[PDB]
Amino acid sequence: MALTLYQRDDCHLCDQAVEALAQARAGAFFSVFIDDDAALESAYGLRVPVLRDPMGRELDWPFDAPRLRAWLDAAPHA
């Protein structure tokens, strides 16, 4: 319903992502594990740390706090 930050086994790459999120003060969201759906793995795989919105957009893995927020503001929240 809200945001969607795909993650995979081990915490590190996605860890930094969550950091930017928290920093950006995104808020609450839903986590999805790609470690189970090859479809998602093939779709993302390396781009596991992909930020998706309910509007129908995504954000690059590599981002910042103000860059992630500014991207968030681009869309509504709930």
XYZ file of N, CA and C in Angstrom:
234
model
N 0.823 -1.198 0.000
C 0.000 0.000 0.000
C 0.866 1.261 0.000
N 1.812 1.290 0.927
C 2.710 2.426 1.044
C 3.949 2.183 0.181
N 5.103 2.475 0.763
C 6.363 2.294 0.060
C 6.706 0.803 0.015
N 7.804 0.502 -0.663
C 8.251 -0.874 -0.789
C 9.755 -0.923 -1.063
N 10.490 -1.402 -0.070
C 11.934 -1.507 -0.190
C 12.334 -2.983 -0.217
N 12.638 -3.460 -1.416
C 13.035 -4.846 -1.592
C 14.405 -5.108 -0.963
N 14.501 -6.241 -0.282
C 15.744 -6.619 0.369
C 16.018 -8.110 0.164
N 17.247 -8.501 0.469
C 17.649 -9.889 0.324
C 18.461 -10.338 1.540
N 18.763 -11.627 1.568
C 19.530 -12.193 2.664
C 20.693 -11.259 3.002
N 21.194 -11.405 4.220
C 22.302 -10.584 4.677
C 21.868 -9.117 4.701
N 22.363 -8.403 5.701
C 22.037 -6.995 5.849
C 23.329 -6.186 5.721
N 23.331 -5.284 4.750
C 24.491 -4.444 4.511
C 24.166 -3.414 3.427
N 23.910 -3.924 2.230
C 23.585 -3.065 1.105
C 22.226 -2.405 1.348
N 21.285 -3.215 1.811
C 19.946 -2.727 2.087
C 19.988 -1.917 3.385
N 20.946 -2.265 4.232
C 21.105 -1.582 5.504
C 21.272 -0.081 5.255
N 22.236 0.242 4.406
C 22.508 1.629 4.074
C 21.253 2.294 3.504
N 20.482 1.502 2.774
C 19.258 1.999 2.169
C 18.291 2.437 3.271
N 18.095 1.544 4.230
C 17.201 1.825 5.342
C 17.671 3.092 6.060
N 18.985 3.247 6.121
C 19.573 4.404 6.774
C 19.104 5.692 6.095
N 19.201 5.697 4.773
C 18.792 6.854 3.997
C 17.296 7.098 4.203
N 16.556 6.002 4.282
C 15.118 6.083 4.477
C 14.827 6.742 5.826
N 15.388 6.152 6.870
C 15.198 6.669 8.215
C 15.623 8.138 8.256
N 16.791 8.398 7.688
C 17.322 9.751 7.654
C 16.346 10.685 6.936
N 15.864 10.221 5.792
C 14.926 11.002 5.003
C 13.608 11.132 5.768
N 13.491 10.338 6.822
C 12.292 10.354 7.642
C 11.075 9.937 6.813
N 11.294 8.952 5.954
C 10.229 8.454 5.101
C 9.007 8.120 5.958
N 9.198 7.166 6.858
C 8.124 6.746 7.741
C 8.013 5.221 7.784
N 6.775 4.748 7.755
C 6.520 3.318 7.790
C 6.360 2.799 6.360
N 6.641 1.514 6.196
C 6.533 0.885 4.890
C 6.524 -0.639 5.015
N 6.450 -1.295 3.866
C 6.433 -2.748 3.833
C 7.701 -3.295 3.174
N 8.245 -4.336 3.788
C 9.452 -4.960 3.274
C 9.098 -6.244 2.519
N 9.792 -6.451 1.411
C 9.562 -7.630 0.593
C 10.892 -8.348 0.353
N 10.875 -9.652 0.589
C 12.067 -10.460 0.404
C 12.078 -11.111 -0.981
N 13.158 -10.860 -1.708
C 13.304 -11.413 -3.044
C 13.830 -12.846 -2.944
N 14.390 -13.157 -1.783
C 14.932 -14.484 -1.547
C 13.781 -15.481 -1.392
N 13.181 -15.824 -2.522
C 12.072 -16.762 -2.526
C 11.410 -16.757 -3.905
N 11.432 -15.590 -4.532
C 10.839 -15.438 -5.850
C 11.940 -15.130 -6.866
N 12.249 -16.130 -7.678
C 13.278 -15.979 -8.693
C 12.898 -14.833 -9.633
N 11.597 -14.692 -9.847
C 11.092 -13.644 -10.716
C 11.604 -12.289 -10.227
N 11.500 -12.089 -8.920
C 11.948 -10.846 -8.316
C 13.477 -10.782 -8.364
N 14.092 -11.936 -8.151
C 15.542 -12.025 -8.167
C 16.083 -11.638 -9.545
N 15.433 -12.172 -10.570
C 15.836 -11.892 -11.938
C 15.527 -10.435 -12.288
N 14.410 -9.957 -11.759
C 13.991 -8.587 -12.007
C 14.969 -7.629 -11.324
N 15.234 -7.908 -10.056
C 16.145 -7.082 -9.283
C 17.526 -7.734 -9.184
N 17.587 -8.798 -8.397
C 18.835 -9.518 -8.208
C 19.902 -8.613 -7.589
N 20.529 -7.821 -8.445
C 21.568 -6.908 -7.998
C 20.921 -5.622 -7.478
N 19.778 -5.293 -8.063
C 19.053 -4.098 -7.669
C 18.059 -4.424 -6.554
N 18.483 -5.311 -5.666
C 17.644 -5.716 -4.551
C 17.149 -4.470 -3.813
N 18.116 -3.571 -3.490
C 17.790 -2.342 -2.787
C 17.119 -1.336 -3.723
N 15.866 -1.622 -4.046
C 15.104 -0.753 -4.928
C 13.897 -0.196 -4.170
N 13.790 1.125 -4.184
C 12.693 1.793 -3.505
C 11.549 2.021 -4.495
N 10.401 1.445 -4.167
C 9.229 1.577 -5.016
C 8.129 2.349 -4.284
N 7.319 3.047 -5.068
C 6.229 3.829 -4.509
C 4.897 3.267 -5.010
N 3.803 3.677 -4.314
C 2.471 3.223 -4.677
C 1.976 3.934 -5.939
N 2.577 5.083 -6.206
C 2.209 5.867 -7.373
C 2.543 5.118 -8.664
N 3.699 4.472 -8.654
C 4.146 3.718 -9.813
C 5.517 4.201 -10.287
N 6.413 4.373 -9.326
C 7.759 4.829 -9.629
C 8.774 4.133 -8.719
N 10.038 4.257 -9.093
C 11.110 3.648 -8.323
C 12.278 4.624 -8.176
N 13.135 4.329 -7.210
C 14.294 5.168 -6.956
C 15.562 4.315 -7.029
N 16.616 4.922 -7.554
C 17.889 4.234 -7.686
C 18.359 3.772 -6.306
N 19.083 2.662 -6.304
C 19.598 2.107 -5.064
C 20.466 3.174 -4.392
N 21.450 3.690 -5.175
C 22.350 4.712 -4.669
C 21.651 6.071 -4.593
N 21.442 6.524 -3.366
C 20.787 7.802 -3.143
C 21.266 8.443 -1.839
N 20.617 9.542 -1.483
C 20.966 10.256 -0.267
C 19.707 10.454 0.581
N 19.866 11.228 1.646
C 18.755 11.503 2.542
C 17.835 12.545 1.902
N 18.464 13.655 1.432
C 17.715 14.728 0.799
C 17.280 14.333 -0.614
N 18.027 13.403 -1.191
C 17.731 12.931 -2.533
C 16.591 11.911 -2.498
N 16.530 11.176 -1.396
C 15.498 10.168 -1.226
C 14.193 10.847 -0.804
N 14.335 11.859 0.038
C 13.182 12.597 0.524
C 12.549 13.402 -0.614
N 13.395 14.148 -1.309
C 12.933 14.965 -2.418
C 12.184 14.083 -3.419
N 12.620 12.835 -3.501
C 12.002 11.884 -4.411
C 10.660 11.459 -3.810
N 10.646 11.356 -2.489
C 9.439 10.961 -1.783
C 8.375 12.047 -1.953
N 8.776 13.275 -1.656
C 7.870 14.406 -1.772
C 7.240 14.408 -3.166
N 8.001 13.904 -4.126
C 7.531 13.842 -5.499
C 6.166 13.152 -5.536
N 5.937 12.311 -4.538
C 4.682 11.584 -4.445
C 4.062 11.821 -3.066
N 2.758 11.452 -2.950
C 2.040 11.620 -1.698
C 2.465 10.561 -0.677
N 1.885 10.665 0.510
C 2.193 9.728 1.576
C 0.905 9.337 2.305
N 1.057 8.437 3.265
C -0.081 7.973 4.040
C 0.422 7.228 5.280
